[PDB]
Design an enzyme around this catalytic site. Structure first.
Site, short mmCIF file in Angstrom:
data_model
loop_
_atom_site.label_atom_id
_atom_site.label_comp_id
_atom_site.label_asym_id
_atom_site.label_seq_id
_atom_site.Cartn_x
_atom_site.Cartn_y
_atom_site.Cartn_z
N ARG A 1 44.98 29.28 30.72
CA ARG A 1 44.33 28.84 31.96
C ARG A 1 44.92 29.42 33.24
O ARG A 1 44.22 29.55 34.23
CB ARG A 1 44.35 27.32 32.05
CG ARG A 1 43.22 26.62 31.32
CD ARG A 1 43.44 25.12 31.35
NE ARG A 1 42.22 24.39 31.05
CZ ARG A 1 41.84 24.05 29.83
NH1 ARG A 1 42.59 24.38 28.78
NH2 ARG A 1 40.71 23.38 29.64
N1 ADP Z 1 35.55 36.25 38.05
C1 ADP Z 1 36.54 36.02 37.14
N2 ADP Z 1 37.06 37.04 36.42
C2 ADP Z 1 38.04 36.83 35.52
N3 ADP Z 1 38.57 35.62 35.26
C3 ADP Z 1 38.14 34.52 35.91
C4 ADP Z 1 37.07 34.66 36.91
N4 ADP Z 1 36.84 33.43 37.41
C5 ADP Z 1 37.68 32.58 36.78
N5 ADP Z 1 38.46 33.22 35.89
C6 ADP Z 1 39.49 32.60 35.02
O1 ADP Z 1 38.90 31.74 34.05
C7 ADP Z 1 39.72 30.59 33.86
C8 ADP Z 1 38.85 29.38 33.56
O2 ADP Z 1 39.65 28.21 33.46
P1 ADP Z 1 39.25 26.98 34.40
O3 ADP Z 1 38.52 27.59 35.57
O4 ADP Z 1 40.46 26.11 34.63
O5 ADP Z 1 38.19 26.17 33.51
P2 ADP Z 1 38.70 25.10 32.42
O6 ADP Z 1 39.28 23.97 33.25
O7 ADP Z 1 37.45 24.73 31.66
O8 ADP Z 1 39.72 25.86 31.62
C9 ADP Z 1 40.53 30.42 35.13
O9 ADP Z 1 41.89 30.10 34.83
C10 ADP Z 1 40.42 31.74 35.86
O10 ADP Z 1 41.70 32.37 35.97
MG MG Z 2 39.71 21.94 33.97
#
Ligand code: ADP
Ligand code: MG
Ligand code: ATP
Ligand code: MG
Lengths: 203, 528, 571
Positions: B344
């Site tokens: 994450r």
């Molecule tokens: N445009 C993007 N490109 C690459 N990675 C991304 C992008 N947007 C978000 N992420 C990554 O995806 C991850 C999704 O985890 P999160 O947003 O915490 O959702 P969840 O809580 O369901 O894990 C984030 O930690 C972030 O670093």
């Molecule tokens: Mg979350």
């Protein structure tokens, strides 16, 4: 400062930028008429920007402005549609005695009732920084802010640091006495000792 | 005075009577060396689970016990470092004598610090594993579960994460719950061999030990970790593993008389694990200023992540590293399932150089694995598909490293950039090329006067692409080309090896003079 | 009439806010610099636009809106007081009337024997225990007889021992609510979680567990869902319309970029709709809560968001009460102030798990898969207070975790019983580099119907879904047989489907700090027209690589023209 005033004028490294900092529009209109043909992007700092805003159907309150130059600035905007840059964010104080700035969180372009502007804020700093970094040469000649108190002088210091941190081959000029004072206190490629010389040259 | 007396002994639990203000997990002293904790209590009775044992003391009905009135505190001694200890602070194995004065006494059941006491997790924790460093980053203050089946390399992954901290200011704490004493002694010997003994503690509760000791082991270990964090240190804690801890708590609860729940666990097992894996993280300067990284381990049965305890652990942690039995049977080491694994924190947990170097590896791996699976059914394969198969095979060969092998962080970043830039495709399923390249880069960035400065700038600052291209094409590429040509002979005949390497200098003579002088293979620019 | 008389009514904050709604004419808009237009557009929550013509047209279109013109006209007249109908009432003032001591202890469950009482104990009331200069709340669960109750802690159970004295007002748990709660971080029981000094929150005490209804029939005076909430996200706006006053389940996450989804949604509702947001983090990770708080402070939507964090390390009772506290805060903001609220739940699965833990701790026989007997009733108790009335709409976005991707799990079934829309995030698309990584095939919404949308929108959505499904079916043949093994029609369908798939990607505003490219806010009509043009094949000559992470179809056309022109210029 004959070389810095003549060579940078006859053969400037286009594109260029103009930073006209001043208290009144009428003060530097001629340079503008000229700068309206010498450059394409024009940064206006000081109460001239407030005059422009008052010409632009924007609440200003009681900030000093050349009401005779309001219609001239509006006509210039009507004729020249992409030849002006105006600040968006301000640090405002109702009084003048070193009062803590008041920030407009939403719809920053509008000055509230009973408030008056003194200096441009961080968002205006970024807006002007983009334009100056994009360009090649500068003619900084205005403390867009108020140097009387530090509550409204941080904008001029910030823009001076931004222009003096532009690594490369950016040519710089000086045409303002308050700009000269700011440059001396800060510690330009060749800053003219007297701003009146450059003012007469560009007049 | 002994204000409690034993009335019944069932299932290794002690039932005590007397008038006292009992509290949950309160310490009861039966002698000067035997103590227990309280599970349930009336206004005049209590149920107690013992932590240790004494051969001379024979607890019977009618024996006298003393209620201390306070919960358990672990003492901190100066010789915990480089030692294997109990949950009571007794040195089982030691390397330095004890001063016999406690630095501090810390509650083992403290509450996790609140939200205003935290700070952003933005500093990498060097695991030493190329795939984990590049694709599943771990920051300092993060909780990264390691989950998988039996015998798939989870303990080796955690041990690698601890060994990568040899030249680092991170204190290692290994908590073993229900493990064998032979394995623990082997881990101690591994710590001694790799020169991390002077900074590593082991808290042991073997399967032979009391169930309450196996229950309290992670709490005592993380109390020691919090002691070290309070003085601004960075701590890395491994729990091996939490399924045995959950089983110990279930046994305690079922013997006490608590009503069973799903899978016969007590009703508060999630709170038991969550209140433990929430006191680790990065803290603000005025709350200690350090950080605690945790690497809990979970065992699944036949790759079933739907069990109660694995589901709780996945819900709690910040990311998961899945180890696959199928990937293990295919020869991959470490057998890490990149598709199932998640982190994450993301780039935030990397350096700027590493975040730039490993921008698009996940897409490469995903499409390579898809094409690899479909390769057994297709007949016509596109040129782009062949090229991406080639790149994916190169990447899969890149992340295959030996047991207890630490690959440095910048070396992994450089290898990723070499992969993405195409200079890791000339070979044909040959590993010695990768080993030679890794050795050359390691000795370049470690055993040099200019390579050291390049390593420092790569560690501290995030450079753009142009200066990186200069770095690669001016120093790294000629040295690597010379060393590969000197070690790999036939590679000159390869068309792709020379097509990409025509515009790179020929530093052969200077480096041959260097190696004739006896210098290690990969040092260059000796201006000292 | 007189502006001076009007100004005496609006508060300083009110006039500063009303500076937003002042209208600029077309001539007024024309005489602005491009950065001035960008700043005005940003202040109205419509992203950034480099083109002057498009920016002016967007500002005019937003100005030419019924809600905007009503709020602009109301900004000139003196202040109008929102006289509430059926408002929330504060708790009654009482002394402490029941006094007892703890007689039995356990893990999280404590038995209290009442010694001195002036009134009989009621269910679900709170006992207060003061230990070591700290108060602990014990919620009553079962009343065995006149002088014996079972309780479970709300918070930390450390310090509770046999003989601890407890006092109760015979009332439920209460928290301080007001407009001052907006911009602070608290836990379900009101404790402060954003500064060490714990600056008090000003407001009135309210009991989140008391509905305060005249009669059961009053609960049936509720407006059925008819409106659609606009978000500026192309996929959600086109294929997965979000109800206003309903429920939307954001099922999925983990590296799919879900956080950006919830931030973007909060920001869009705070700015484009001028609403209030309540974030109830159930079972919230401490690191994730701290990061969300800091990012809200950094992006400037903290001042209009109220955070209620029930942390992961707390007792099951507090994690249970988090959702109820959030619902109560939203109800206060709607009934007493008339403002529309966007309630956020994270996570629903953890709320169900906390309920199950509490039920198992109180020695109740578990149901299937070990869950609580009252699982569906508890879900109803939480979800039936998120409704729409005349005062305003409380629309809720709820993120759920599906354990092991088992949609037949009882918790998933219970939550699916209430979701009016579902947004399923796919790990495969996230790996592919497609963001915001929403699968447009298996997701659906009940607002995509003739009752709420134009037939043009319905037909566009149906054609898009059919095209995407056919493209997905043909991609396997492409992978196995080859691009030359298809028919001309199938080739055209594949190309149109690829263009449609990559057009639905969008760069978010709240992410431009990382991506370094300005985010976009696509209005529904613009996205509909873009999808309509793409469906027609009018851009099949453009390479697909120009469709990735763009705002509108006009941007694609302009970029393709620019690139090609400059190519030819050099040539
Ligand atoms: N445009 C993007 N490109 C690459 N990675 C991304 C992008 N947007 C978000 N992420 C990554 O995806 C991850 C999704 O985890 P999160 O947003 O915490 O959702 P969840 O809580 O369901 O894990 C984030 O930690 C972030 O670093
Ligand atoms: Mg979350
Ligand atoms: N990277 C590696 N290269 C080679 N062998 C490895 C590697 N990682 C692990 N192994 C080997 O795999 C075997 C199992 O490793 P390990 O003990 O770490 O697994 P585990 O998942 O912790 O198992 P257990 O369930 O028995 O505790 C050992 O023989 C170890 O040497
Ligand atoms: Mg193991």
């Amino acid at each position: 400062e004959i070389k810095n005033l003549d060579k940078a004028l006859s053969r400037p490294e286009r594109p260029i930028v103009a930073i006209l900092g001043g208290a009144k529009v009428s003060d530097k209109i001629g340079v503008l008429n000229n700068l309206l043909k010498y450059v394409d992007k024009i940064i206006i700092g000081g109460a001239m920007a407030y005059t422009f805003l008052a010409a632009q159907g924007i609440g200003i309150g009681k900030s000093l402005v050349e009401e005779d130059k309001i219609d001239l600035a509006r006509e210039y905007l009507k004729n020249n549609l992409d030849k002006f840059v105006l600040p968006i964010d301000y640090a405002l104080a109702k009084d003048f005695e070193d009062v803590k700035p008041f920030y407009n969180l939403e719809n920053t372009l509008e000055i509230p009732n009973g408030y008056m502007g003194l200096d441009i804020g961080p968002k205006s700093i970024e807006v002007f920084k983009k334009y100056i970094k994009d360009a090649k040469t500068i003619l900084w000649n205005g403390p867009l802010g108020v140097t009387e108190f530090k509550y409204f002088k941080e904008g001029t210091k910030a823009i001076a640091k931004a222009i003096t941190e532009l690594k490369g081959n950016v040519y710089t000029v000086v045409g303002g006495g308050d700009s000269v004072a700011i440059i001396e206190e800060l510690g330009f490629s060749h800053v003219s000792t007297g701003g009146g010389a450059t003012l007469e040259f560009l007049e | 005075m002994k204000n409690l007396k034993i009335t019944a002994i069932k299932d290794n639990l002690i039932f005590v009577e007397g008038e006292h203000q009992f509290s949950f997990l309160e310490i009861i002293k039966f002698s000067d060396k035997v103590e227990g904790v309280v599970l349930k209590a009336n206004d005049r009775s209590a149920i107690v689970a013992i932590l240790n044992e004494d051969k001379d003391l024979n607890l019977t009905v009618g024996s006298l016990a003393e209620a201390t009135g306070e919960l358990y505190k672990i003492p901190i001694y100066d010789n915990y470092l480089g030692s294997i200890i109990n949950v009571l602070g007794e040195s089982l194995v030691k390397q330095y004598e004890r001063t016999n004065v406690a630095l501090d006494k810390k509650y083992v059941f403290t509450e996790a610090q609140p939200i205003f006491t935290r700070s952003a997790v933005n500093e990498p924790l060097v695991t030493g594993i190329t795939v984990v460093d590049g694709v599943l980053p771990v920051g300092r203050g993060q909780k990264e579960l390691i989950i998988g089946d039996r015998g798939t390399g989870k303990t080796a992954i955690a041990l690698n994460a601890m060994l990568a901290q040899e030249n680092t200011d991170v204190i290692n704490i290994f908590i073993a719950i229900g493990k064998k004493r032979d394995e623990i002694v082997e881990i101690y010997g591994t710590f001694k061999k790799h020169n991390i003994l002077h900074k590593s503690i082991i808290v042991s509760a073997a399967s032979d030990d009391a169930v309450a000791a196996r229950y309290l082991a992670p709490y005592a270990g993380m109390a020691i970790a919090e002691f070290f964090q309070q003085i601004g240190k960075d701590v890395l804690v491994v729990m091996d593993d939490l399924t045995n801890h959950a089983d110990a708590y279930r046994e305690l609860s079922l013997l006490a008389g608590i009503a069973p729940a799903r899978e016969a666990y007590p009703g508060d097992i999630f709170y038991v694990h969550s209140s433990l894996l929430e006191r680790g993280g990065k803290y603000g300067p005025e709350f200690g200023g350090g950080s605690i990284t945790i690497l809990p381990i979970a065992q699944t049965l036949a790759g079933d992540i739907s069990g109660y305890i694995p589901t709780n652990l996945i819900s709690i942690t910040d990311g998961q590293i899945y180890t696959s039995a199928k990937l293990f049977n295919e020869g991959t080491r470490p057998a890490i399932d990149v598709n199932l694994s998640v982190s994450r924190l993301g780039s935030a947990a990397q350096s700027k150089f590493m975040a730039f170097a490993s921008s698009g590896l996940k897409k490469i791996y995903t499409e390579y694995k898809y094409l690899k699976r479909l390769s057994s059914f297709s007949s016509k394969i596109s040129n782009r598909d062949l090229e991406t198969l080639q790149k994916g095979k190169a990447f899969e060969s890149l992340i295959d490293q030996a047991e207890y092998e630490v690959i440095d962080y910048e070396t992994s970043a450089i290898l990723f950039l070499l992969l993405k830039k195409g200079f890791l495709n000339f070979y044909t399923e040959k590993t010695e090329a990768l080993k030679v390249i890794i050795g050359v880069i390691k000795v370049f960035l470690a055993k040099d006067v200019l390579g050291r400065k390049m390593r420092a700038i790569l560690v501290e600052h995030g450079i753009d692409s142009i200066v990186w291209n200069l770095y690669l094409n001016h120093m790294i590429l000629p040295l690597l080309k010379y060393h590969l040509l000197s070690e790999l002979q036939y590679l000159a005949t390869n068309r792709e090896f020379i097509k990409k390497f025509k515009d790179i200098r020929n530093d052969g003579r200077i480096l041959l003079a260097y190696e004739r002088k006896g210098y290690e293979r990969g040092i260059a620019y000796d201006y000292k | 009439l007189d502006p001076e008389f009007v100004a005496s009514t609006y508060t300083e904050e009110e006039i500063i806010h009303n500076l937003l709604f002042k209208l600029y004419s077309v001539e007024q808009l024309a005489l602005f610099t491009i950065d001035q237009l960008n700043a005005l557009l940003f202040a109205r929550g419509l992203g950034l636009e480099k083109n002057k013509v498009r920016a002016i047209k967007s500002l005019l279109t937003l100005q030419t809106s019924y809600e905007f013109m009503e709020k602009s006209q109301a900004a000139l007249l003196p202040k109008v007081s929102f006289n509430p109908t059926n408002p929330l009432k504060p708790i009654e003032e009482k002394e402490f009337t029941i006094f007892g001591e703890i007689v039995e202890i356990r893990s999280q469950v404590y038995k209290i024997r009442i010694d001195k009482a002036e009134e009989e104990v009621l269910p679900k009331v709170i006992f207060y225990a003061d230990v070591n200069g700290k108060e602990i709340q014990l919620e009553v669960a079962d009343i065995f007889d006149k002088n014996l109750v079972s309780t479970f802690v709300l918070g930390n159970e450390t310090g509770l021992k046999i003989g601890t004295k407890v006092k109760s007002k015979n009332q439920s748990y209460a928290i301080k609510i007001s407009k001052r709660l907006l911009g602070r971080v608290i836990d379900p029981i009101g404790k402060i979680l954003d500064d060490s000094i714990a600056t008090p929150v000003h407001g009135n005490m309210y009991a989140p567990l008391e509905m305060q209804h005249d009669s059961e029939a009053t609960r049936y005076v509720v407006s059925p869902k008819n409106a659609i909430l606009e978000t500026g996200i192309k996929v959600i706006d086109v294929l997965l319309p979000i109800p206003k006053g309903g429920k939307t389940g954001l099922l999925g996450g983990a590296g799919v970029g879900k956080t950006v989804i919830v931030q973007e949604l909060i920001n869009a509702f705070i700015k484009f709709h001028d609403g209030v947001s309540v974030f109830a983090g159930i079972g919230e990770r401490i690191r994730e809560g701290h990061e969300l708080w800091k990012e809200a402070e950094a992006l400037g939507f903290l001042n209009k968001t109220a955070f209620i964090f029930g942390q992961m390390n707390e007792s099951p009772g507090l994690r249970f009460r988090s959702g109820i506290s959030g619902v109560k805060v939203a109800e206060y903001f709607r009934n007493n102030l008339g403002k529309s609220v966007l309630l956020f739940m994270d996570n629903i699965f953890r709320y169900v798990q906390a309920g199950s833990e509490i039920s198992s701790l109180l020695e109740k026989t578990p149901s299937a898969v070990g869950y609580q007997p009252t699982l569906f009733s508890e879900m109803g108790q939480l979800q039936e207070r998120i409704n729409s009335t005349k005062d305003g709409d409380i629309t809720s976005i709820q993120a759920m975790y599906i354990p092991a991707d088992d949609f037949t799990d009882p918790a998933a079934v219970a939550a699916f019983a209430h979701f009016d829309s579902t947004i399923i995030l796919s790990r495969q698309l996230a790996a592919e580099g497609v963001y915001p990584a929403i699968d447009p095939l298996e997701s659906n919404s009940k607002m995509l119907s003739i009752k709420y949308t134009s037939r043009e929108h319905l037909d566009i959505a149906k054609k898009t879904v059919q095209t995407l499904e056919k493209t997905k079916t043909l991609e396997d043949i492409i992978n196995i047989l080859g691009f030359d093994a298809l028919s001309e029609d199938d080739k055209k369908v594949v190309e149109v489907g690829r263009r449609l798939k990559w057009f639905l990607t969008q760069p978010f505003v709240v992410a431009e700090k990382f991506s370094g490219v300005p985010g976009k806010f696509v209005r529904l009509k613009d996205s509909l027209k873009g999808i309509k043009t793409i469906l027609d094949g009018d851009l099949n000559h453009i390479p697909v690589s120009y469709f990735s992470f763009v705002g509108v179809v006009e941007e694609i056309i302009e970029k393709f023209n620019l690139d090609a022109k400059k190519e030819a210029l050099k040539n």
